[PDB]
Structure 1
């Protein structure tokens, strides 16, 4: 059974076919690939874009999406095996995934790490649990990676540059400020897709502490070798932006500080200058800027940068709808 957990699990040809079908769906939005079909959208965390695009995406293809939020409307779910369920969780994922499997044709799931222990969050328990027990394809709506975002980001870049071949472009994935430590998911996905597309990637971040988990640094290396791009870590702002064609910002908490954020606050707090402003975008080769959203103005990027015609954040967000309809159509 084929799922959509990570773009890394898919071949370049399949990914390419997906992006092309996404471009096609963008030209003809209404269809019947999901006629009479349905998808269960399971959200363990907030969402505006993902929830809306999937729900409309299912409607436009003749299907229906059922939105569930364990702990809110649906019963809380247990993922650990062989445990005694006398706590807060009412039912086990082994039952939930099989029950949903009898109702829907697809299951999407969103579950952010708990932030208490990266050693456990990095295992991707929820996503893997759904894929293991569900008899129908599973779609990652963001856990420790954000594959749907990757394709919406990629398509937006190919549209911008007028070509599917992004090789040669100087790509800069820069960490940015936020009063609190966030999930690395989007950052991990960005590095994965930028290198998979064969671009010259520079992971700009404050200190070595903010470097992404090895799993993704290695995925990137393997992608560079195969795609013909390059990987580079940097702690110097100006040099990174130098001649960049694309700038993707995202804030996240230093992995080494998981479960012990108190001593991390003072550190991230001394790097508020990482905010993307006009000066930094000026050093780029008339580069394009984007962010996965939700974005906090004058914190992650300035008003001017967001209002800039070089900001393709809205196009990328729109592409979530088209790229996701392509994933669903391919999974059924």
Structure 2
């Protein structure tokens, strides 16, 4: 009966809509929801540090009335001195949710199968579903309804943002295109899962090496750091590519950006950019996710 969020498709289309509505409500009234008043605890655990992820979760948990107990790298990695299952059993006595940044999906699934509190994938090798919640919140702010929009992601199509934009995007009814060079394409099982979910929402999945075609008529253009660099240079999100999009298109980028590589100063700082609101919305979207999971768990 305990709900987890390890990958974007763990929410149904209707559930994702609820979380995104909650994110908009919490952005307007950031201390109106206090499910963790007490304070109650939430564990925020990093096998590898991610300062931006820790910052967003730590403040968000505090604004829900709770106390984040943060476990950094440098500390004993989880599972090193104790079985994962033993640690999960005790954690479930101390905190009301477990937020975890680890690498393989195997470890996340193992924790979710045993823990009796919700487990959230803060960021992993395969998915980055909290950032895509924030992306979807950002798109809804700038454009309104998500269903039927065209979103193109450019660059490394095998990384966690590509996978999550596929799954999270089609869950929202967005037609998702991944524009990537050969050998950096989506994981085939992720692509299949997105194609299947798209059948329910009227969305679609496209994977192409043609950056021009992916930009043409796009409503949302996304990229992410590339880490040779040489296969990705034709996919740089520059002014020439942006000029092909639909009017009022917006540009997203999980920060940090490497200006001059995957994205140019002119695109980052121009009027289509929504990267600053997008970064802020990690706070609101993650708070919404926690509120929603806690209420069901």
Q: TM-score, normalised by structure 1?
A: 0.82
**3-state SS of 1:77 partner:** coil
Residue 98 in structure 1 maps to residue 89 in structure 2: yes
Q: Which residue of 2 aligns with 1:136?
A: 117
**CA deviation map 1:147-169 (0-9, x unaligned):** 111111111111110x2x32332
State the distance in 2 between where 1:252 and 1:191 align: 18
**3-state SS of 1:220 partner:** helix
**CA deviation map 1:98-131 (0-9, x unaligned):** 222221111100013xxxxxxxx4xx11211221
- Residues 47 and 77 in structure 2, CA contact (< 8 A), matched pair in contact too: no
**3-state SS of 1:135 partner:** coil
Q: Which residue of 1 aligns with 2:175?
A: 200
State the distance in 1 between where 2:10 and 2:139 align: 22
The aligned runs of 1:212-223 (5 Å cut-off) are 212-223=186-197
Give the superposition deviation at 1:270: 4.0
State the distance in 2 between where 1:35 and 1:183 align: 40
Q: Which residue of 2 aligns with 1:117?
A: none
Q: Which residue of 2 aligns with 1:4?
A: 5
- Residues 154 and 180 in structure 2, CA contact (< 8 A), matched pair in contact too: yes
State the distance in 2 between where 1:194 and 1:329 align: 22
The aligned runs of 1:61-210 (5 Å cut-off) are 61-70=64-73, 72-73=74-75, 75-78=76-79, 89-112=80-103, 121=104, 124-143=105-124, 144-161=126-143, 163=144, 165-175=145-155, 184-207=159-182, 209-210=183-184
Q: 1:228 to 1:270 in 2, by over 3 A?
A: closer
State the distance in 2 between where 1:172 and 1:312 align: 15
- Residues 38 and 105 in structure 1, CA contact (< 8 A), matched pair in contact too: yes
**CA deviation map 1:176-209 (0-9, x unaligned):** 5xxxxx97111100111122222222211112x2
**CA deviation map 1:278-309 (0-9, x unaligned):** 11111111321111112211111011111112
**3-state SS of 2:48 partner:** coil
- Residues 76 and 91 in structure 1, CA contact (< 8 A), matched pair in contact too: no
State the distance in 2 between where 1:168 and 1:14 align: 18
State the distance in 1 between where 2:37 and 2:166 align: 35
**CA deviation map 1:230-264 (0-9, x unaligned):** 221211121221121110113467xxxxxxxxxxx
**3-state SS of 1:269 partner:** coil
Of 235, 255, 261, 1:293 maps to 255
State the distance in 2 between where 1:41 and 1:8 align: 22
- Structure 2 residues without counterparts, runs of 5 or longer: none
Q: TM-score, normalised by structure 2?
A: 0.91
RMSD (CA atoms): 1.8
Q: Which residue of 2 aligns with 1:84?
A: none
State the distance in 2 between where 1:199 and 1:33 align: 32
